[PDB]
Amino acid sequence: NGEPIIVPSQDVVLGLYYMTRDCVNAKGEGMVLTGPKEAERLYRSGLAS
Amino acid sequence: AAKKMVEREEAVVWDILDEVIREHPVLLNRAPTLHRLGIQAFEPVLIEG
Amino acid sequence: TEFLKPRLVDIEQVSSTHAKVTLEPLERGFGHTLGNALRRILLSSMPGCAVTEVEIDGVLHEYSTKEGVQEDILEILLNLKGLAVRVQGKDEVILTLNKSGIGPVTAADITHDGDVEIVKPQHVICHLTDENASISMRIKVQRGRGYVPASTRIHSEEDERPIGRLLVDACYSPVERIAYNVEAARVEQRTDLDKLVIEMETNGTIDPEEAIRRAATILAEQLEAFVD
Amino acid sequence: TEFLKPRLVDIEQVSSTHAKVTLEPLERGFGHTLGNALRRILLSSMPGCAVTEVEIDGVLHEYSTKEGVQEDILEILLNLKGLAVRVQGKDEVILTLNKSGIGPVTAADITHDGDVEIVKPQHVICHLTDENASISMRIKVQRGRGYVPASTRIHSEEDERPIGRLLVDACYSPVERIAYNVEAARVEQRTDLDKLVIEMETNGTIDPEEAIRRAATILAEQLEAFVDLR
Amino acid sequence: YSYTEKKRIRKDFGKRPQVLDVPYLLSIQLDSFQKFIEQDPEGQYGLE
Amino acid sequence: KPLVGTGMERAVAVDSGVTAVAKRGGVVQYVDASRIVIKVNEDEMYPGEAGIDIYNLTKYTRSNQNTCINQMPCVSLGEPVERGDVLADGPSTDLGELAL
Amino acid sequence: EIKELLKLGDLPTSGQIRLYDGRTGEQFERPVTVGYMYMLKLNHLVDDKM
Amino acid sequence: TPEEKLLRAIFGEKASDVKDSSLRVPNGVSGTVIDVQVFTRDGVEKDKRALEIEEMQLKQAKKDLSEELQILEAGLFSRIRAVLVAGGVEAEKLDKLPRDRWLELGLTDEEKQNQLEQLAEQYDELKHEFEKKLEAKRRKITQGDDLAPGVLKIVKVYLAVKRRIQPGDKMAGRHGNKGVISKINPIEDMPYDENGTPV
């Protein structure tokens, strides 16, 4: 078929699912961020989930 | 002389191996090769082990 | 019992505010030590000056809207968070901005002081929609360390603040993003050694290599008590 | 730039092998940094003294038995791999061990030198099960860091070794477990200050303050290349 | 408990009691060759 | 020895014939790494023999799969043993328990 | 019975403790199952297969 | 080999210069040598090393049989002194008497005297079967080995490799949880609990 054979399998999948999946009152909810670099800064510093 | 040099595995033999390996693909194959993606080519990285 | 000092091989200048330094060889498991120490120090201890408070006339909270502008005052607070500033002498400079007419007010339109300079004057704060639309604000710049958010700021302050004191997230540290990795390196035979690749991107007010040297300075001055 | 600095305030030697070292005071956010850096450095790169070669008299290889001893020769070499010893003077010393008669052979029966201190004299080595059965060996103790196996040592052995000299793997590092914590410090004018209690478990062959001194020396010498040139 | 079983007693979590113990695990081969090689009066097995 | 076992470990380690179980109960007289001598108790002794059991152990014998087979003594000097007691461990046994 | 034994040994009864990353020093977000399993070395050795 | 087969063709096969056909250790295989055994064909003189191995086996078998004879003699003499102490009150007169004079003395005929007599006959047949088994073992290890036809001698070398784990080795649990070791991580890199014990 035309479909890609390079599909991520189960660990990449578990990691990106845990990455993208939301929660209702985790930590640092409702902030307004300048961008993805500030989101990465918040997560690596520990001020947001 | 080259055969006994490789038989004793000099550091220049490992350096020449590092030069030979670079940009020389090898084919990795796993049986049973049911479809054509059971043989693929890769650029080898010299590892220990 | 002597160690393998790293000999620097690369400082790739991607942009004027971007760098990929590379450090090989290190001893096995030292790339993660040095990379995590430098990333932690740069993220949560490197001091600087940034926007901490702004007081716009007529507005009482961050979700109310002042007219005359096409983007919200949430966008204005975002653009004022993204502003990069450097104060030389003091730790408390109140910046006052006044603008009117058709045209987006940029960072060059601020009533600047002598001890305060802007590294990006083309940074647009907000766009104006009317000729008679006037905007007046009181940007406050403090000096702190790392990142202090508005949630922790409003947990700390408790008095009834005057009307217009909108809390903006205080991002004091000049590093915008630091991300390292550990690769494989080799001296003649052994391959257990590693190669530290630090990718750094900052705003103005500092260079990336200057910020890495400042973080190494901070860690060495933290360690210098118990050194043989 | 108004940071404070930590000092070694006290050391709680719980046992000969266990210790807790407190650093105080630490700024807000530096406890985890210094604790993880000191943990990785103290776990990977501390120097120490480990048994390298054993030469038992009358024994050709490790897969043989001697008449009289209860243990096998390979189990004897494993027990000597577990031996803890410090050497104050030199970098390589050879210890002689002689014993006879029924009874356990311990590290206390090793004929000590002036600069060699065996920090566990109750560490058993072998046994002897006859009145007329004697053991005699010669234990070479070197100093290094990390884990050096006998195969890599042979590939680093450009010399010539006789038959009958047994090789032991060398686990040189004297640190066995490190736990750290970041507790809040009680400072009369500051509230964002911390204390770092590092709970170090050794084999009794390294001083805690000397180990932390050498770990911070290693970290500063590694950071020199960052602080100098970009 | 015997003086060699007091050295390390394995804490059993079993509930039902062992009425019949587990037999000799190699009884099949040894019993077959013993029947082949032994001497028998009338119940003839093997060489006889 | 496994921390979570079943109870069949001792049965396999004795019934496999790879250990060295005691034939008669008594006290242990001499333990080398290759020989265990047991002085038999008098009630288990035949009246015509000397009452001494010798247990020679196999040391570093190649198996069929090119592995190691060696027996190590698990009893100490002077300890008493009964009939059916493990004196020497096998290749992958430990105190008479199977340990893989 | 397993949880009563874990409560005797002063261990978490759910069998999951907090683990920290050895490299970053940081804590793993979810509690991780830690315990002792009996692992065997099989006779398929890469010295014999290479 | 064809590198020198043409050189043995056009210049001349010398009918000399013998071939190296030595037993070599295989490649990538270390390990010590723990036992050598030489089986020569019955009829020819063996070698100096084969003769040395044979003298080692001779003195080993003699030491083993004499040690088991001394152990059985000590057991039998302890049973003799126990049964004579149970019979009569003779304690010091048997300690200062040598152990050879333990089977001929005593008192009149009782059950312990019949036991002493049958244990003396047990000692006699014990040393008789000792010297018979020693001569049988001696002739068994001095006689030659009837090997295959066409075989002069076989030398059996025994290596002993000690194999550590490495990436590539299959490891498994008891529930079908198999798999291959992928990396041997440092203990500072392994995850650890609140007490610092890494997994």
Assign 3-class secondary structure to E1-48.
CCCCCCCCCCCCCCCCCCCCCCCCCCHHHHHHHHHHHCCCCCCCCCCC
* Cα–Cα distance, C81 to C148 (Å, whole number): 12
User: Is some CB atom of chain F closer than 8 A to the CB atom of H30?
Assistant: no
Single-letter amino acid code for the residue at F87: L
A31–C179 CB contact, under 8 Å: no
C-alpha–C-alpha distance, residues A22 and A19, integer Å: 8
Residues with Cβ within 8 Å of residue D85, at least 6 apart in sequence: D49, D51, D95, D107, D116, D117, D118, D119, D141, D205
Does D39 contact H188 at a Cβ distance shorter than 8 Å? yes
Q: Is the minimum CB–CB distance between D44 and chain H shorter than 8 Å?
A: yes
Strand F26-31: give its sheet, edge to edge: F52-56, F35-40, F26-31, F80-81
Pairing of strands C170-171, C147-148: antiparallel
Q: Across the interface, do H158 and F62 touch by the CB < 8 Å criterion?
A: yes
**How many Cβ atoms are within 10 Å of F28's Cβ, its own excluded?**
23
Nearest alpha-carbon partner for C42 in C208, C227, C225, C204: C208
Distance CA F2, CA H171 (A): 16
Window 12-41 of C, Cβ < 8 Å to H:
28-29, 32
**Window 3-22 of F, Cβ < 8 Å to E:** 5, 7-9, 11-12, 15-17
The first and second tokens of residue B30, run together, are 């796993």
Phi, psi of D125 (to 5 degrees): -120, -60
Interface probe with F: pick from D60, D64, D65, most Cβ of F within 10 Å:
D65
- Count of CB pairs separated by less than 8 Å, G with H: 61
Interface residues from chain C to G (CB-CB < 8 Å): 32, 36
Taking a C-beta distance cutoff of 8 angstroms, is the pair C72, C191 a contact? no
Whether G24 and chain D come into contact, CB under 8 Å, resolves to yes
Q: What does the DSSP assignment read for chain F?
A: --SS--S-HHHHHHHTS-SEE-SS-EEEEEE-SSEEEEEEPGGG--TTS--EEEEE---SEE-TTS-EE--EE-S-TT-EE-TT-EEEE-SSEETTEE--
CB-CB: which of H34, H75, H158 is closest to F39?
Answer: H75
Distances (CA, A) of G40 to H78, H164, H167, H177: 48, 13, 15, 10
Alpha carbon of C86: minimum distance to chain D alpha carbons (Å): 15
Backbone CA torsion sign across G10, G12, G16, G18: negative
Resolution in A: 3.1
E-strand ranges in chain H read 32-40, 153-160, 170-173, 178-180
Alpha carbon of residue D173 to chain centroid: 4
Q: Do you find a cis peptide bond into H98, omega within 30 degrees of 0?
A: no
**Per-residue exposure over D15-30, b if at least 16 CB sit within 10 Å of its own CB, e if not:** eebbbbbbbbbbbbbb
Distance CA C27, CA C35 (A): 13
Torsion of Cα atoms, C211 then C215 then C221 then C223, to 10°: -160
- Please name the residue of chain H whose CA is at the shortest distance from the CA of residue D152: H30
Instruction: Give the Å distances, CA to CA, from G33 to C137, H188, H199.
Output: 55, 20, 11
Which residue pairs, CB below 8 angstroms and at least 24 apart, start in D106-112?
D107/D83, D110/D139
Q: How many whole angstroms separate alpha carbon F90 and alpha carbon F98? A: 9
Q: At C115, is the secondary structure helix, strand, or coil?
A: coil
Q: Which of D75, D127, D129 sits opposite F30 (nearest CB)?
A: D129
CB-based contact C227:D213 (threshold 8 Å): yes
Q: Does G36 touch chain F (CB under 8 A)?
A: yes
Residues of D numbered 118-157 whose beta carbons fall under 8 angstroms of chain H's beta carbons: which are they?
149, 151, 154
H188 contact C CB<8A: yes
Contacts of C130 (CB under 8 A, 6+ apart): C68, C102
G35 contacts chain D (CB < 8 A): no
* C189 contacts B14? CB cut-off 8 A: yes
Distance from CA of H192 to the nearest CA of G (A): 5
Best CA proximity match to D39, nearest among H193, B33, H188: H188
C223 backbone dihedrals φ, ψ, rounded to 5°: -85, -20
User: C130 vs chain G: nearest CA distance in angstroms?
Assistant: 50
User: Edge-to-edge strand order for the sheet containing H170-173?
Assistant: G39-41, H170-173, H178-180
Asked if residues F25 and F39 have their Cβ atoms less than 8 Å apart, the reply is no
Rounded Cα distance between F25 and F43, Å, is 9
Residue C49 vs residues C87, C201, D227: alpha-carbon distances, Å:
6, 17, 23
B49–H contact, CB cutoff 8 A: yes
Per the CATH hierarchy, to which homologous superfamily does domain C47-171 belong?
DNA-directed RNA polymerase, insert domain (2.170.120.12)
Q: Which residue has the tokens 């496999």?
A: F16
CB contact under 8 A, B11 and C189: yes
Rounded to the nearest 10 degrees, how much is the dihedral formed by the CA atoms of C117, C122, C128, C133? 30
Quick check: do E and C touch, 3+ CB pairs under 8 A? no
C188 vs chain A: nearest CA distance in angstroms? 35
| G20/H190 CB distance under 8 A | no
Cβ contact C54:C77 at 8 Å: yes
Closest by CA position to H70, among listed H137, H123, H136, H141: H123
* Whether H33 and D61 lie within 8 Å, measured CB to CB: yes
- State the Cα–Cα distance between residues H159 and H162, nearest whole angstrom: 10
| C-alpha span between D102 and D5 (Å, rounded) | 58
* Chain C, nearest residue to D39 by Cα: C33
H33 close to D (CB below 8 A): yes
Flag if F80 and E7 touch (Cβ within 8 Å): no
Tell if the CB–CB gap between D220 and C225 is shorter than 8 Å. Answer: no
Closest by Cβ to F95, choosing from E2, E8, E25: E8
Report yes or no: D105 and D131 within 8 Å, Cβ to Cβ: no
Solved using: cryo-EM
What residues in G contact C36, CB-CB < 8 Å?
A: 23-25
Chain A positions in Cβ-Cβ contact with residue C43 (cut-off 8 Å): 41, 44-45
Q: Under 8 Å CB-to-CB from G38, ≥6 apart: which residues? A: F2, F3, F4, F100, H173, H174
Tell me, yes or no, if F86 comes closer than 8 A to chain E by beta carbon: yes
| Distance spanning both ends of chain B, measured CA to CA | 27
Q: Are C24 and C9 in contact (CB under 8 A)?
A: yes
- First vs last Cα of chain E: how many Å apart? 46
Q: Residue G32 and residue G35: Cα distance in Å, rounded? A: 10
Q: How far apart are CA G43 and CA E38, in angstroms?
A: 40
D149 contacts on H by Cβ (under 8 Å): 164
